[PDB]
Amino acid sequence: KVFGRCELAAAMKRHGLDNYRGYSLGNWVCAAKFESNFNTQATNRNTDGSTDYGILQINSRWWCNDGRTPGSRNLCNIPCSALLSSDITASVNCAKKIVSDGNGMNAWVAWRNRCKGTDVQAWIRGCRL
Numbered sequence: 001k002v003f004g005r006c007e008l009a010a011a012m013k014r015h016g017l018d019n020y021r022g023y024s025l026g027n028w029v030c031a032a033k034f035e036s037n038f039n040t041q042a043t044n045r046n047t048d049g050s051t052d053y054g055i056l057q058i059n060s061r062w063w064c065n066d067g068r069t070p071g072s073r074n075l076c077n078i079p080c081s082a083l084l085s086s087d088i089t090a091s092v093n094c095a096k097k098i099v100s101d102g103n104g105m106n107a108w109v110a111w112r113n114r115c116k117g118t119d120v121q122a123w124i125r126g127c128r129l
């Protein structure tokens, strides 16, 4: 599923991401925009052989199990496929673990490079919510 911006904002809000660990909803929407272009099915292979999954591009090195990332953990206790669902619950739940992990949203390289420090509220501007 490719979310619309406002539709994703709504979904993220519903799932308790707005201001989760202090990160306003625009941060999450922005991160999702640049991580996946709001596409729940987004996948990207990393050079280390791990893969990033879903609307927030959660990595199999730590967070999910894909059966093909040797020595990996599965800290969200989920198959990485769960992260590709049109329903964002698993992505959100895993994102919450990630962002609690100590480096906050810097875990998401696109957030750090494209969202951090920017007018992230623009991403939820005009949305009803």
Ligand SMILES: [Cl-]
Binding pocket: 005, 033
């Ligand atoms: Cl957009």
Ligand SMILES: [Cl-]
Binding pocket: 024, 025, 026, 027, 120, 121, 122, 124
């Ligand atoms: Cl915001």
Ligand SMILES: [Cl-]
Binding pocket: 056, 057, 058, 059, 098, 107, 108
């Ligand atoms: Cl991540």
Ligand SMILES: [Cl-]
Binding pocket: 065, 066, 067, 068
């Ligand atoms: Cl497996």
Ligand SMILES: [Cl-]
Binding pocket: 065, 066, 067, 068, 069, 070, 071, 072
């Ligand atoms: Cl694995």
Ligand SMILES: [Cl-]
Binding pocket: 072, 073, 074, 075
């Ligand atoms: Cl684990």
Ligand SMILES: [Cl-]
Binding pocket: 021, 022, 103, 104, 105
């Ligand atoms: Cl933080």
Ligand code: NA
Binding pocket: 060, 061, 062, 063, 064, 065, 066, 069, 072, 073, 074
């Ligand atoms: Na893993």
Ligand SMILES: [Xe]
Binding pocket: 043, 044, 045, 051
């Ligand atoms: Xe991929």
Ligand SMILES: [Xe]
Binding pocket: 012, 032, 055, 056, 088, 091, 092, 095
């Ligand atoms: Xe998400």
